[PDB]
Structure formats: C-alpha cells, structure tokens
Design a protein around this ligand. Sequence first.
Ligand SMILES: Nc1nc2c(ncn2[C@@H]2O[C@H](COP(=O)(O)OP(=O)(O)O)[C@@H](O)[C@H]2O)c(=O)[nH]1
Length: 165
Amino acid sequence: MTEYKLVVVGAVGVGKSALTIQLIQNHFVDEYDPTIEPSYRKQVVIDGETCLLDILDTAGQEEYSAMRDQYMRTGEGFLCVFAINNTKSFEDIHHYREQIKRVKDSEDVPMVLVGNKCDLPSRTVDTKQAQDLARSYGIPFIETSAKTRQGVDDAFYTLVREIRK
Ligand SMILES: Nc1nc2c(ncn2[C@@H]2O[C@H](COP(=O)(O)OP(=O)(O)O)[C@@H](O)[C@H]2O)c(=O)[nH]1
C-alpha cells in the first residue's frame, strides 16, 4: 500500500496536536491517557483504497526555522491549520504557504486549509474569508473541531486526495 507523509503546520495554539490525536486515537483532552504512547503511522481506507498515513506534527517547533524547513522538505502534503477565533493564526497561513512553495521550489504543493475550533462560538475569521483565501490558493478548505471530531477525517483524507491528484 502507498504511504503518505503528511505534515501539520500552523501557529502555536491552533490545535495541531488535538487534531492529530483525534485522527489517531479518536478522543479529545478529557480522555487523554499519559501512559499511552500512540503511533503517528495509521492504516486507513480512503475512497476504497487502503493506505498508510505517516503524520508529522510541528507542535513545539513552530518558530524553529531550520526544523520547519526539514518538515517541509520531507512532507508530501501539508495541513495548514489556523483557529477560527485567532485572526493572527489565519494571517500566519500566508507565511507557511510561502515557505512551503520556496522549500519545494514549486507553486503546486498538496495542501489543505483547515479552520479549527469551529465548535467555539467566538469566531473572528469568517467562513467566507477562509473560503476566498483557499480559492485564491487553488486548495480545499475544511472547517474542523478536534473537540467534536467534526471534519477531522475529512481534512486528512482530503489532503491525501490532493496528493493523489
Ligand atoms: N474547543 C476546542 N478546543 C480545541 C480544539 N482544538 C484544540 N483545542 C484546544 O486548544 C489548545 C491548543 O491545542 P494544541 O493541539 O495543543 O495546539 P498546538 O499544538 O499548539 O497547535 C488545547 O488546550 C486544546 O484543548 C477544538 O477543535 N475545539
């Protein structure tokens, strides 16, 4: 089966780790078990095809430029995550996309825009604003909640579909 190297990027606090843990372990913070050490290699079936997701989370190294570049060289596809209640995290998406294009030396890198924490009421980034940004980038946009699991599989699966294109 094919393996897909997926990298989760985005500002500190947007929920990169929470999203990955929902995909891998199927729960949120209340069910966090510190005795369990999960694997970020997961076998899944996407559109009837079985494959392996190999996930890298940049959490803790967001501001570590040399390591950011290593993630971007390695990754086949990128989840570009912001939080819908953090406009600065949305603005940071520009810088992540730019750096990915530069490290890859390409303008057509598999990428999905993810607006996380859509379960929260206090939104500061409109769904239409994120849709327009993704449109300008030529990439999909998905709203997610690591808390309710809304859109979590869809975000990762859609990224795999982008790589498959
Ligand atoms: N309500 C809500 N909280 C979230 C969601 N995703 C993450 N969080 C919370 O946001 C905080 C930061 O999440 P984390 O994954 O550690 O952020 P990061 O690794 O810095 O990107 C954590 O305390 C999470 O509980 C979400 O979808 N909904």
